[model samples]
Target: GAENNMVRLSRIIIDPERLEEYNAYLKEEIEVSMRLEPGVLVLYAVAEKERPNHVTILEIYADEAAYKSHIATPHFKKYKEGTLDMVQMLELIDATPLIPGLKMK
Candidate 1:
């Protein structure tokens, strides 16, 4: 029944010159959403070891409703529009856990 849980992996490539700005915006968005949204489980952002501009984010939401709500939030919209120029490329990928850690937090 809980298979509706949504987990997404986002591959982001930022413009080299606007890297700092992009990071700042991403940080604020992550912080605000996690603090204010009950269904936002995790927003983990990581950069590649050798390629600092290559970023990958792990977004975990409680379910489809949460994911829908997230994209509609003001903070998310602001981040999406504000960072448009700073982002070189963006790719969103859906994921499913193999072990299905149901009882896990």
Candidate 2:
């Protein structure tokens, strides 16, 4: 399943005042996607220590179809539509691992 994995690295800058609400929405989205979507292999989001509103997310999916399905989900919609105004800037990068067999653990 992971052999066809698609990975992404995203940079997100949120409006400082709406950081808390954005965090909540993102957390809820992550939880729901992880529990319900089989293709959602991994999602790890972090914020800059010095700049709490500066966020980054590591996203992995089983394949292209998986990612397409993910964005079409209700949970994803909640995050996209709900947090539209809270986000200041966003960047998404397609990632390729140097070693395919690398283990997380």
Candidate 3:
């Protein structure tokens, strides 16, 4: 069994005019976090079928420290600052996993 920790579901509305640039930035951030941070368990990004600019990210961290550390990383800072204008709206929702201790090999 695993310890209960942080789960974040973020809803983002990107500026239509800057979608391409935002995508590049977002992809890079996700890739970097997954590759460099052992605490980042998963980062799943998705967009609505009808509204491409409407994005959602399902993020799971090993713990609160991991989540805190992630935001302080350079890659995350870059994404946060770089995409400020591109992100028209953003909402972050905290979640409790139904199976926090379960993981697939």
Candidate 4:
């Protein structure tokens, strides 16, 4: 159960016109909530180079408590509240990390 709570990956497919708005929301959340929370090891949000409007957020937390705190953060709430109209489809996937060694190219 504990390990299961380590990571959360969310993919949000948004309208092309709202890409900027969605990105802004994620950036603000990272700045205010993630930066302030020590347990948030990494928070990444990126739009697909090809699809453009397809945004994926990869989040890794130290534990379940940290994940819980993430959802309750003001920035997270703000993102949700502000973008209620902008969001189209959301797909969430629970993950297990698989680290690999590779040379930078």
lDDT of 1 by residue, 1-105 (tens): 346668889999999999888998999999999999999888899999899899999888988889899999999998999999998899999989664545545
**Superior by lDDT: candidate 1 or candidate 3:** 3
TM-score of each: 0.90, 0.94, 0.92, 0.83
- Which pairs clash inside model 2? none
lDDT of every model, 2 decimals:
0.89, 0.92, 0.91, 0.78
Q: Which tens-of-lDDT digit does each residue in 20-95 have in candidate 4?
A: 8877887888887666998886777787899988888887777888888888987889988988888899998987
Candidate 2: segments with Cα more than 4 A from true spot: none
Best prediction by lDDT: 2
- Runs of candidate 1 with Cα error greater than 4 angstroms are 102-105
User: Best candidate, TM-score-wise?
Assistant: 2
**Over the stretch 10-104, how does candidate 3's per-residue lDDT look in tens digits?**
99999999999999999999999999999998889998989999999998898888999999999999999999999889999998888886666
Model 3, position 42, has a per-residue lDDT of: 87
Lowest-scoring 10 consecutive residues by lDDT in candidate 4? 96-105
RMSD of each: 2.0, 1.1, 1.5, 3.5
- TM-score, prediction 2: 0.94
TM-score between model 3 and native: 0.92
